[PDB]
Curated annotation (Swiss-Prot):
Changing residue 63 to Q: 2-fold decrease in enzyme efficiency, as determined by kcat/KM ratio, and efficiently inhibited by chlorzolamide. Changing residue 193 to F: Normal activity. One of its GO terms (cellular component) is myelin sheath. Changing residue 117 to K/R: Strongly reduced CO(2) hydrase and p-nitrophenyl acetate esterase activities. Changing residue 61 to F: Reduced activity. Its cofactor is Zn(2+); Co(2+). The modification Phosphoserine is found at residues 161, 168. Target of drugs used in treatments against glaucoma disorder and breast cancer. This is Carbonic anhydrase 2. Changing residue 195 to H: Higher affinity for bicarbonate. Enhanced proton transfer capacity. Changing residue 117 to A/G/I/L/S: Reduced CO(2) hydrase and p-nitrophenyl acetate esterase activities. Changing residue 58 to V: Reduced activity.
């Protein structure tokens, strides 16, 4: 699987039949239909004690991995039940600034989308969490192009080191708090992961407020390679999945 013409999102169903399941993601957030829900608690992000380990190029995006051996970086509150531990963060971006995000807002597409992945700590590990309806929690943040994001520059600067598929680089003392918008206002719905295996185990929390990144920071994402070192060069761009049918599901708003 990939994002090309022959192995793109339209082909995933052949190997991952859940592709046309009942709670697939991403989706379009119709803000006039989203339901203001008063029973939604504020989001609670405890990330001061986070421990980054490394960054990888897995062939479909780059991953920043965290130590999830202990309750170091956790998300709670909101529509969530229990504590979810941060395991990794990654992005989805486009070849141009008018596309890149996965979720859309009133059909509006953003330059990129940041996903913070967390697993429910009553299931013990990541692998068990993906076997449950409430196993994961992904915090989604949209990236628009404007002014630079001081907080994202360290990520940007090590991209050169993991240009191709399989590369990895030590990447300690990175604070994810530098990627959060000011407001924690969100929309939430029951979904799935956006890349195969597309396991419908996720509780989405899409932040209303976008972060701005500069043109040159986004430009560096686009210099990555899907391909392995020594193979023809295929730029890592447009690694996003098209919006799926909401199919009965209701999108709730915390504001
Ligand atoms: Hg699941
Ligand atoms: Zn993602």
């Amino acid at each position: 699987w990939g994002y090309g013409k022959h192995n793109g999102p339209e082909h995933w169903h052949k190997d991952f039949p859940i592709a046309k399941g009942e709670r697939q993601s991403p989706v379009d957030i119709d803000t006039h239909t989203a339901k203001y829900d008063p029973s939604l608690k504020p989001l609670s992000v405890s990330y001061d004690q986070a421990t980054s380990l490394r960054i990888l190029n897995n062939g479909h995006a780059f991953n920043v991995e965290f130590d999830d051996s202990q309750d170091k970086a956790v998300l709670k509150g909101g529509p969530l039940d229990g504590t979810y531990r941060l395991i990794q963060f990654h992005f989805h971006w486009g070849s141009l600034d008018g596309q890149g995000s996965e979720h859309t807002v009133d059909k509006k597409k953003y330059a990129a989308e940041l996903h913070l992945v967390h697993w429910n700590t009553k299931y013990g590990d990541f692998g068990k969490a993906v076997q449950q309806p409430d196993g994961l929690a992904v915090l989604g943040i949209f990236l628009k192009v404007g002014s630079a994001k001081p907080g994202l520059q360290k990520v940007v600067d090590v991209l050169d080191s993991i240009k191709t598929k399989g590369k990895s680089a030590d990447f300690t003392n990175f604070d994810p708090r530098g990627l959060l918008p000011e407001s924690l206002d969100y929309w939430t719905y029951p979904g799935s992961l956006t890349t195969p295996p597309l396991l419908e185990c996720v509780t989405w929390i899409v932040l209303k407020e976008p972060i701005s990144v500069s043109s040159e920071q986004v430009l560096k994402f686009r210099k990555l390679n899907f391909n392995g070192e020594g193979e023809p060069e295929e730029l890592m761009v447009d690694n996003w999945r098209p919006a799926q049918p909401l199919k009965n599901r209701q999108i709730k708003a915390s504001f």
